[PDB]
Design an enzyme around this catalytic site. Sequence first.
Site, PDB file in Angstrom:
ATOM      1  N   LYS A 159       0.838  -1.192   0.000  1.00 47.00           N
ATOM      2  CA  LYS A 159       0.000   0.000   0.000  1.00 47.00           C
ATOM      3  C   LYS A 159       0.877   1.247   0.000  1.00 47.00           C
ATOM      4  CE  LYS A 159      -4.288   1.282   2.478  1.00 47.00           C
ATOM      5  NZ  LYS A 159      -5.141   0.596   1.469  1.00 47.00           N
ATOM      6  N   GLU A 191      -3.895   6.616  -4.177  1.00 44.20           N
ATOM      7  CA  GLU A 191      -3.211   5.422  -3.703  1.00 44.20           C
ATOM      8  C   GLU A 191      -2.773   4.568  -4.887  1.00 44.20           C
ATOM      9  OE1 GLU A 191      -4.843   2.720  -0.413  1.00 44.20           O
ATOM     10  OE2 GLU A 191      -5.138   1.440  -2.168  1.00 44.20           O
ATOM     11  N   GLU A 214       0.205  14.549  -5.732  1.00 38.62           N
ATOM     12  CA  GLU A 214      -1.137  15.108  -5.614  1.00 38.62           C
ATOM     13  C   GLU A 214      -1.621  15.677  -6.938  1.00 38.62           C
ATOM     14  OE1 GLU A 214      -1.610  18.939  -3.444  1.00 38.62           O
ATOM     15  OE2 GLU A 214      -3.001  17.796  -2.183  1.00 38.62           O
TER      16      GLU A 214
END
EC number: 2.1.1.57
Length: 278
Positions: A159, A191, A214
């Site tokens: 992750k 993610e 981002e």
Amino acid sequence: MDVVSLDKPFMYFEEIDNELDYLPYQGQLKLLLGELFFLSKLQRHGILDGATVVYIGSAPGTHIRYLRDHFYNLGVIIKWMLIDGRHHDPILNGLRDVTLVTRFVDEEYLRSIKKQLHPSKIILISDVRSEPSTADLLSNYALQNVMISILNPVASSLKWRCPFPDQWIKDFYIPHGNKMLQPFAPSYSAEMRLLSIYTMRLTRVTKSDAVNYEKKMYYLNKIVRNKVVINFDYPNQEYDYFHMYFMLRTVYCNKTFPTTKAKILFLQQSIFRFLNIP
Ligand SMILES: Nc1ncnc2c1c(C#Cc1nc3ccccc3[nH]1)cn2[C@@H]1O[C@H](CSCC[C@H](N)C(=O)O)[C@@H](O)[C@H]1O
């Protein structure tokens, strides 16, 4: 959805080439695809066979049943070890090759599971999570490095969502690897899955990287994923299906199909039916 003509989707974060100023049980589908992609890549490299998949943060893990049944039906010898403080989906019950473990892992317990699996090949899949703060993430990612330094897996999927730049705390380190993009992620999730094959060098993540993540991910979720791939020969030409299609064609099947499209359609059908998606 604005129409677009594409030869391939973005498979890894590095491939995003622009930036912008920021389904039922879709979550199981996202996990299932990326883990079918990761484990199928390992199968191509001849290293999945004879390995033990240690999946930490695996609960409820409904989709893991499809993963096991997939490789079991290909004849690939895999043992699973699913570890989580929470109870797994009961659909994982009664499978001799799947070991269910109800425990939150720490350093001490990673040592002992290494001891009992050594010298067998370990493939690590982590999905642990403690809305989360930047301190929660830094703890999570540290623990994942602790998983790699102790379990020393031959490959890992971790992750990986960078902390937002406006919640930065400190630079931290993550393993080298390819940052695999996830179709059918939440609309504006940033993610990815960090995929690594070990032959472990750590990488500094800085606040500027958090800005790059981002913006690149926002462009992907606002622009790219809201397109229709009109050259795409498929019942659904939305990008996430275009993206899913290219992942699914790295998957192996005992059945033979007249065309690659027929193979992807069968696989998608299979996956959706098991996950109860229309
Ligand atoms: N240590 C662990 N070991 C194992 N599993 C863990 C954790 C952990 C933690 C922690 C933690 N906080 C701390 C605070 C202070 C000190 C030490 C600390 N340690 C969280 N999880 C599991 O991650 C899943 C995310 S959803 C996956 C979904 C799943 N992949 C699916 O297929 O549905 C949840 O099910 C959750 O139970």
